[PDB]
Symmetry: C3
Subunit: 324 residues, 3 copies
């Protein structure tokens, strides 16, 4: 696994907690590793996140089953406890299993209804999300988007604001109001922050004044973005998380929170989906698929300030995976 | 071919005789070599097994036609006799074909209703199957199974008895009778033999060579034997076939075949998912005593010098 | 593009002009390079051929739109003029695009109703085609044929003459007339020429055929039978080392009503060849030496000369 240590020792989302019911077995991929996630049948059981590989004969444990608080390999029925230790070999039921019969386990935390995994030793905290515990804000989750592009391209595109009047034409501007005001970007001890920024939206409802939004966002780590939007009657926040499948593939998910009417959920999710799929069309075709750090090399203009700072930040962090 | 010499000089099943009719052209793939099988229209004509490659311009001979005891390439019509010598170049009908105009031919034998092929020099005869000569036993053939796993993984899985109660629950074991008694396994000059052992019915098997297995199962009222043959397509792909014989009622045939198909499909589900796809010889695999037969098999392949399809 | 320099500096066909309508955007692939072809909405606007690549963030320009004689990238709306210089950055509409905001453009010429492209610097003219301005000749074009074989294999198979009786039986021969007369073949500074020879059909049942390649992927073929003459220009697009596009421009001085019969005969013969070409191993064309891979008998004289000519030119792309 060629991921840089700075990536291995971070937290990434691999699933939503609501898709991982008691007694379930789920698969995911993170930084090139196959993972199995499983839970015992008890209510509120913790989630285990292991490499999807039985030490006996290399069969995926995800093809087995959960029984009596153990994951059971389908091939010879070896049973692994929550710590990943083999505690029973059915062929020799009075034999202590070899101390080497042990799954490779990883760190797992549930936070914000999401399943966070660290494949290494977590040097960092899970990013913060201040509105999570605020009862004035409702919450919803997008579907997960599988995207054939580097996770760092996915985050680069989400930090770029100048493309709004073109590929989000009709939602976030139009081709003839495309000028980009000066941008305020900082890379410091809190990571990358984009200062408050006006976005002219296209009018949809002519009875109402132009719902002009003001955005700002912070990245405390390069594959997770906290975004704040103020409209005329409402504040919307989201936690955008990118799962780095490998160097060339990503999963994109949003946790969205807003303090307007709960009835807005359907419209919020449909509007995110329309924006994300427009982005995915560009991401899928971008050349090369990995993000070039500072084919001709990419040109930069003043409105690229944000994405330029992002690329510099990645070089400072020693990122070599998913970039070129 | 780049398979090890020990594998090159052994016999492998590549087809059923019933599929090689007089006049026919069929193909197979063995140890990375594409093969053409063909027969003249004479009744009882022999089967030729050649590399599927016309040496003029590299077109598959299997796209050709069998005319007058010759195989005819479709591109320029060069005609090859039963020994694979080019005997006619139509562009120059008076010319004697040069000596290099020769198909690459291989050894072929029909035995037990199957087409056996040796790509090198057969130093063995075809493995024995005693019940073929016993008219008290009926016979049937499974269909062939194309498996995306190393052939040595396929054979390794078939000798590993401890998985029976877990993935063959109902035909070869009970999840409540999963304990495995002391296995007796012996690797000889006669190959690998597993001693008689009880299945919850007594079973034993012998492999005279790494990819052919003879297996014998005795119930209270009936004996069943089969010859299990693995075609090594290449390092990562196999064809599996069984010749099954039994001395019980002949009406049991469809049940027997159903049982085999169910057991094979359960095995394929596991084989397809196993990693790596090639059989590791001796993270690494762990061994408990009920791995006795599978460890002995891996040691045998290592002793034999097998490097194709392994590790 | 790891293509040899002698390939990069030659001309190749990448489209028919009828495929490139005013205002259109189409794509092509040449020697590993992805191409965008586009035209203004004006009638008889010139054709631009560029690398399919926006220099800003690497989006294919082929996903854009033609507007006001410019190609507009869809990502951030930069506009490139017919020379491929960026003329407008909409985020900074009063700013002058940096000099580096320039598409990678290629040489393009329309000739014989075909779009010719040179990725490097042209050292030759587009091949000559004498009958193009003869008003006694009608013209027609085949469709384009994508072939999963090296373009040198495609060209090799079309100068092979001894296979006509076998895979083209009923159109270019039959198995009762499979014997090949002596072949006149000359390779020199001006390419490969095959002298007149007799093709059997259904004096007698025959045509006389010759052909010439001034360059290794373009062939001029001439066939005469009973006062009617057919010529064609066969052009192979080298997509990469393992893939190609085949096109024909056909001209003939007989009845106009032969057009659809000519097209069907060409199509049948081409599909018969593709069946062979897709089965051949290796995919790339094997050159000559310093179970045999290849054997050569006297009727192979023209394909042997072709292989020798390719080594002499220094071709390593698409051969082996
Ligand atoms: N994390 C992010 N959520 C999005 C919010 C929600 O609005 C929509 N429609 O997605 N709006 C917005 N302008 N930013 C900048 C890029 C897209 C996004 N980034
Ligand atoms: N050569 C072999 N044939 C197969 C048959 C399957 O039996 C039934 N009843 O389907 N019998 C048997 N004991 N096994 C163990 C593994 C697979 C197999 N080995
Ligand atoms: N340049 C060439 N065009 C093709 C046409 C095919 O003729 C017809 N009637 O379809 N004519 C011809 N002599 N040949 C032989 C090789 C393929 C081809 N070479
Ligand atoms: S492979 Fe998992 S128990 Fe044997
Ligand atoms: S390739 Fe077989 S005869 Fe020419
Ligand atoms: S990528 Fe083409 S304008 Fe930005
Ligand atoms: Cl449980
Ligand atoms: Cl995608
Ligand atoms: Cl015959
Ligand atoms: Cl499979
Ligand atoms: Fe976007
Ligand atoms: Fe099994
Ligand atoms: Fe042909």
């Amino acid at each position: 696994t060629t991921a840089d240590l700075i990536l291995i020792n971070n937290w990434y989302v691999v699933a939503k907690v609501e898709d991982c019911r008691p007694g379930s077995i789920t698969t995911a991929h993170l930084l090139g590793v196959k993972l199995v996630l499983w839970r015992s049948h008890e209510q509120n059981s913790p989630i285990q996140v292991w490499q999807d590989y039985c030490p006996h004969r290399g069969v995926p444990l995800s093809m087995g089953e959960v029984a009596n608080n153990t994951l059971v390999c389908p091939y010879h029925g070896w049973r692994y406890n929550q710590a990943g230790k083999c505690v029973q070999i059915p062929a020799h039921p009075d034999m202590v299993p070899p101390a080497s019969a042990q799954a490779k386990t990883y760190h797992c935390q549930e936070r914000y209804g999401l399943v966070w995994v660290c494949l290494g030793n977590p040097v960092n905290d899970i990013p913060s999300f201040p509105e999570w515990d605020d009862p004035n804000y409702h919450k919803t989750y997008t579907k997960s988007y599988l995207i054939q592009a580097s996770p760092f391209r996915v985050m680069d595109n989400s930090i770029d604001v100048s493309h709004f009047p073109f590929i989000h034409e009709g939602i976030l501007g139009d081709r003839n109001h495309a000028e980009v005001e000066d941008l305020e970007v900082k890379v410091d001890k809190d990571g990358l922050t984009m200062g408050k920024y006006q976005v002219h939206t296209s009018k949809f409802n002519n009875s109402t004044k132009d719902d002009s939004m003001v955005n700002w966002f912070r990245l405390s780590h390069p594959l997770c973005q906290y975004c704040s939007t103020e409209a005329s009657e409402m504040r919307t926040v989201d936690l955008m998380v990118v799962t780095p499948i490998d160097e060339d593939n990503s999963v994109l998910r949003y946790l969205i929170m807003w303090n307007g009417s709960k009835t807005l959920e359907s419209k919020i999710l449909a509007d995110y989906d329309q924006v994300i799929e427009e982005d995915i069309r560009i991401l899928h075709s971008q050349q090369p698929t990995r993000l070039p750090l500072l084919l001709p090399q990419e040109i930069h203009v003043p409105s690229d300030r944000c994405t330029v700072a992002y690329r510099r930040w990645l070089k400072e962090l020693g990122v070599t995976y998913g970039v070129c």
